[PDB]
Structures are given as C-alpha cells and as structure tokens.
C-alpha cells in the first residue's frame, strides 16, 4: 500500500496534484511493473472544490453550481487512467470515494463523475439510518462492465438474470411501499404483500452483510435465488423459462 495524504489543514491547491501523483505511481506499477493496482481517491469532492477555487481565482468560465466549465475534462483526466492495456499484464482499478453535497446525486461533482466513470456504488443515508451495512442502494448504483464480467464461464450463467430480476422486484417493492404510505395496509393486494416481503428480506439478507463477511459470488447468487423464490415463476418475467426451470426449483 502506498499512501498519498493531504489532510484538511494541508494546502488546498496541492489536492489538484495529489490524484495525479497517485495515478502516476499506479501507472508505473501496472503498465511498467505489471502489478494490479487498486487506486482509491478519497474526497474527490475535495478535489473538485479545490479545482473550483483555482478556477474562480482564474475567473474561468463556470459551469453548473460554479464549477469550471472543464471540470468534466479534468475529472476525466483523473478517472480515465484506469483499465487494462494490450500486451501488459497489469491493471489499474479506480474506486474514487466522493461525497455528494446534500445527498444530491445530480450535484455537478457526482453527476460528472457518473458521466465519466463506469458505474457508481451509491451509499444510502436512509439505509444507514436504519442501520443496514453496507448501506448501498443498488437502484441508483450501477456497473457498466458487469454485462461482460458476468455470465457463463466467469462466475455463473444465471448471474445476469438473477441480478435483473432482483432489480425489478426491489423497484416494485419500493413502489409498493410508496403506494402503501398513501393507501395503507388494507388496500395492498397479495402481490404487493409478496413484493414487500421480498423487499424486507432482500434488505435484511442480501444488502445487509457483516463488515468482515466475504460472500462469494455463488453465495450472493444463492441468496438472490432464495429471495426470488418468494414469487411464483410467473411473476419473474425477466428470467427466461430456460433459466427458471434449471435454477428455480432447488
């Protein structure tokens, strides 16, 4: 582990170069030393705010919420220093940790970071307050390379179908919760009750996880299947019948 540190009391402008120092070291270790480097840039919100300070001093063209018009290109210079490369057995995996101001996923920092990066893991204040660890909201989270990183061969062949069905059922459970806030318990149909039970058990058995518990992908998929089995086969419309027949009965 190689740590580049720039605490709160440290110079503000030096944050503009700290990510680049870290990513240059990672690039040397990956594309020249053939290491697999996980790069973690903490407080990209702080980096973006330092960039805004410098842009304001320069009176550069501002974008949304005062950030420079080139903040996208700068964050891209930071993030796009990832991925594998031909003929070299190294890699650079980036997991920037950025604080959304006021939990606003549409704030320029998170918005441009989502536009650039290949996904996002959304830590949820509601789940954290309910004391669900990790408080990850899969609905706004996303991974752009899952579609190719999962399937037959790598991991298991029901991975994509299980993930999509879990997404759909979780979303419908949230919608049922929203409607239940208005119409009360007594107006929910049996399907809505099924979806609410799925939502409870999904947030309690799938999202909720020990801080030191290392579930394999197969364990995660088995949990997903035991959650999906709440519904009858006909209610799982994402999963094709070929997959349902093989995986559902067990």
């Amino acid at each position: 582990v190689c740590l580049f540190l720039n605490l709160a009391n440290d110079p503000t402008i030096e944050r503009i170069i700290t990510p680049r120092l870290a990513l240059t070291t990672a690039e040397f270790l990956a594309y020249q030393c053939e290491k697999h480097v996980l790069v973690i840039l903490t407080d990209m919100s702080s980096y973006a705010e330092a960039l805004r300070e410098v842009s304001a001093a320069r009176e550069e063209v501002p974008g949304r919420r005062g950030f420079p018009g080139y903040m996208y290109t700068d964050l891209a210079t930071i993030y796009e220093r990832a991925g594998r490369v031909e003929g070299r057995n190294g890699s650079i995996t980036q997991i920037p940790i950025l604080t959304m101001p006021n939990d606003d996923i549409t704030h320029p920092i998170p918005d441009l970071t989502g536009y650039i990066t290949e996904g996002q893991i959304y830590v949820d204040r509601q789940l954290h307050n309910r004391q669900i660890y990790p408080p990850i909201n899969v609905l706004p989270s996303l991974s752009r390379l899952m579609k190719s990183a999962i399937g037959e061969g790598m991991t298991r062949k029901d991975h994509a179908d299980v993930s999509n069905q879990l997404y759909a059922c979780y979303a419908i459970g949230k919608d049922v919760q929203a409607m239940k806030a208005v119409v009360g318990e007594e107006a929910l149909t049996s399907d809505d009750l099924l979806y609410l039970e799925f939502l409870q058990k999904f947030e309690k058995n799938f999202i909720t996880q020990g801080p030191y518990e290392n579930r394999t992908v197969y364990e995660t998929l088995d949990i997903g299947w035991q959650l999906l089995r709440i519904f009858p086969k006909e209610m799982l419309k994402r999963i094709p019948q070929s997959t349902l027949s093989e995986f559902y009965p067990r």
């Binding site: 503000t12 702080s46 705010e49 330092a50 300070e53 304001a56």
Partner: peptide, 9 residues
C-alpha cells in the same frame, strides 16, 4: 467557493 474548506480546516 471555499466555505467547506474553511470550516473543515
């Protein structure tokens, strides 16, 4: 453009 930085520092 630096309120958060000032408060944090």
């Amino acid at each position: 453009a630096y309120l958060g930085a000032r408060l944090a520092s």
